Design a protein around this nucleic acid. Structure first.
Ligand SMILES: [Mg+2]
Ligand SMILES: [Mg+2]
Ligand SMILES: [Mg+2]
Ligand SMILES: [Mg+2]
Ligand SMILES: [Mg+2]
Ligand SMILES: [Mg+2]
Ligand SMILES: [Mg+2]
Ligand SMILES: [Mg+2]
Ligand SMILES: [Mg+2]
Ligand SMILES: [Mg+2]
Ligand SMILES: [Mg+2]
Ligand SMILES: [Mg+2]
Ligand SMILES: [Mg+2]
Ligand SMILES: [Mg+2]
Ligand SMILES: [Mg+2]
Ligand SMILES: [Mg+2]
Ligand SMILES: [Mg+2]
Ligand SMILES: [Mg+2]
Ligand SMILES: [Mg+2]
Ligand SMILES: [Mg+2]
Ligand SMILES: [Mg+2]
Ligand SMILES: [Mg+2]
Lengths: 362, 147
RNA sequence: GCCAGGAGGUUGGCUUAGAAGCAGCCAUCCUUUAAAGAGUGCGUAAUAGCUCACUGGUCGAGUGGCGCCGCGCCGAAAAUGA
């Protein structure tokens, strides 16, 4: 297990010098009496002190399992050297906590997730590749300990999928499948091509947890104003002296509506409200779109080069264009070996591009 | 003669020490030189081990302090036979331990000189009492006897 | 009503950035002693500060709570002049 040591060790090492200088500018700010006088402004101050716990603990735990472990173990069959191995069996136990406490910090990492696959540039082979990816994440779920349900799926003309969607249950379902965003790339001699030469094919992937609803709470009586007024058109003296028309404007949203199709004020006041309900439902569905579709991807051309990870079956090599990381087993990776990818490199760069954005300028 | 402007209650291990709060704002808004004042803190913590030693502070007018180290809380005695670092969330129903009537007696001797409570007979009920409300009930034998 | 103390372990166990009798959760020690409740309210970022509860003194004659009945008070704004 000496191949993942320096990876996890140095992983908690780059936070040492940076947080060292910042916590110093804060800890000395917590001294002067004039600081705490600020109401909630001072909470943001003592808050950063609540981080000197989830940083100094590694300065002690990770540093001790590096100074003591690396010593007595350089050479010996099983005497005092192999006996020092179980001494750090908890070093892999504690490795779990440092890894976890940097993934759940995502928006909704803890809850489940939905993953929709859809073919793209690459002809009918691309339509066939999508089913491969489906069968990849599917096995990756069971083997991760997750449950799976195909929420929807549609076979292609000759391939096997023009579209597919799969809800993965279990904790951190959105966390692990997060870096699976974007279009992947496939390279291999096309099984559908007569000359069988090497063709490229693409396919997009998306991930997102889940939400709820709120239909009636909107039509709170406190919000909208209701008006009464005589009706336009026929009626006799009854129409002139009896106001039955109604105008139910929604004050906040400003959207108004008027009705007077029936001789009655209540049945108009009633209808005019069922009408406002429909429009206010269609106004909540429009705003319900940006906050449930912008999370998918701010782009995703699915074209060429829009990919973030290529899988070449000719020369046998996958490659994450994000971490620059490489590999030599596309045949197994497209079966469940996503852990090696998501764990070390994927979640890293994923949180890195946002973790370097906040701790600098954003 | 003596002098005091504002007292305060602080805690810390019997040896190690750090300027961070809640001890932070303390030795910063009243002054406390770690160049000589702390050298009166390590003298009584060199031979003695570590514990929940709460320094019953008493700041003077001249920024100085009274490093008279007082005995740990009566709750430090329960987590000595058990080994816990907390306490039950509901003292009454559940139970995090069961220190016998003997444990409460042996380590409680340390608490009498600092406390104002009388003999070891009186210093016995206090420690068991500081356990009646922290999720635990003692078990004894001699007890009443009576006529 | 006024003079004085109003505490010690204790900073109650747990939650929590902080919860020092005083957001919340769970609650049933003792002792200097004449008396002071692991605490009534305010004050705090967390504390110190104020007070009751209780005891001492002074005063010097009544005082406090609860149930019931009679009558009454508020709740109570309109359009030609009451
Ligand atoms: Mg209102
Ligand atoms: Mg009209
Ligand atoms: Mg007509
Ligand atoms: Mg008519
Ligand atoms: Mg009419
Ligand atoms: Mg009318
Ligand atoms: Mg004090
Ligand atoms: Mg008087
Ligand atoms: Mg007084
Ligand atoms: Mg007074
Ligand atoms: Mg007293
Ligand atoms: Mg008193
Ligand atoms: Mg006073
Ligand atoms: Mg007690
Ligand atoms: Mg008490
Ligand atoms: Mg006090
Ligand atoms: Mg004051
Ligand atoms: Mg009555
Ligand atoms: Mg009555
Ligand atoms: Mg009446
Ligand atoms: Mg009036
Ligand atoms: Mg009039």
């Amino acid at each position: 297990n000496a191949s993942r040591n320096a990876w996890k060790a140095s992983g908690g090492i780059f936070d040492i010098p940076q947080k060292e200088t910042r916590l110093k500018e804060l800890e000395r700010r917590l001294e002067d009496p004039s600081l705490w006088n600020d109401p909630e402004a001072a909470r943001k101050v003592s808050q950063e002190a609540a981080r000197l716990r989830r940083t100094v603990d590694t300065f002690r735990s990770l540093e001790s399992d590096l100074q003591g472990l690396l010593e007595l173990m350089e050479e010996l069959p099983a005497e005092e050297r192999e006996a020092l191995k179980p001494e750090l069996e908890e070093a892999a136990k504690k490795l779990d906590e440092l890894y976890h406490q940097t993934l759940l910090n995502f928006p909704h990492a803890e809850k489940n997730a939905i993953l929709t696959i859809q073919p793209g540039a690459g002809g009918t082979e691309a339509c066939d590749w999508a089913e491969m990816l489906l069968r990849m994440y599917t096995r990756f779920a069971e083997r991760q300990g997750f449950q799976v349900e195909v929420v929807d799926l549609t076979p292609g003309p000759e391939a096997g999928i023009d579209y597919a969607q799969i809800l993965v249950k279990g904790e951190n379902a959105y966390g692990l499948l997060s870096p699976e965003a974007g279009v992947h790339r496939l390279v291999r001699p096309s099984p559908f091509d007569a000359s069988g030469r090497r063709h490229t094919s693409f396919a997009g992937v998306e991930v997102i947890p889940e939400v709820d609803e709120e239909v009636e709470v909107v039509l709170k009586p406190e919000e909208l104003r209701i008006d009464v007024m005589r009706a336009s058109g026929p009626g006799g003296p009854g129409v002139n002296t009896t106001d039955s028309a109604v105008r139910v404007v929604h004050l906040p949203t400003g959207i108004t509506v008027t009705c007077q199709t029936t001789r009655s004020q209540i049945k108009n006041k009633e209808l005019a409200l069922k009408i406002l309900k429909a429009r206010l439902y269609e106004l909540e569905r429009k705003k319900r779109e940006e906050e449930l579709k912008a999370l998918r991807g701010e782009v995703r051309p699915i074209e060429w080069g829009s990919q973030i990870r290529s899988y070449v079956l000719d020369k046998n090599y996958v490659k994450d264009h994000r971490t620059g990381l490489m590999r030599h087993d596309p045949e197994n990776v497209l079966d469940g070996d996503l852990m090696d990818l998501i764990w070390a490199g994927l979640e890293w760069k994923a949180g890195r591009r946002q973790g370097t954005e906040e701790v600098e300028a954003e | 003669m003596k002098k005091v402007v504002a007292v305060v209650k602080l805690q810390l291990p019997a040896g190690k020490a750090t300027p961070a709060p809640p001890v932070g704002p303390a030795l910063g808004q009243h002054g406390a030189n770690i160049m000589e004042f702390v050298k009166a803190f390590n003298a009584a913590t060199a031979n003695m081990g570590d514990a929940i030693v709460p320094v019953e502070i008493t700041i003077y007018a001249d920024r100085s302090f009274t490093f008279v180290t007082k005995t740990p809380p009566a709750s430090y005695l329960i987590r000595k036979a058990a080994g816990l670092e907390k306490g039950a969330h509901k003292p009454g129903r559940e139970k995090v331990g069961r220190i016998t009537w003997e444990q409460v007696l042996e380590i409680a001797k340390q608490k009498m000189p600092d406390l104002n409570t009388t003999d070891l007979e009186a210093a016995a009920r206090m420690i068991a009492g500081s356990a009646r409300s922290m999720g635990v009930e003692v078990v004894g034998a001699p007890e009443v006897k009576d006529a």
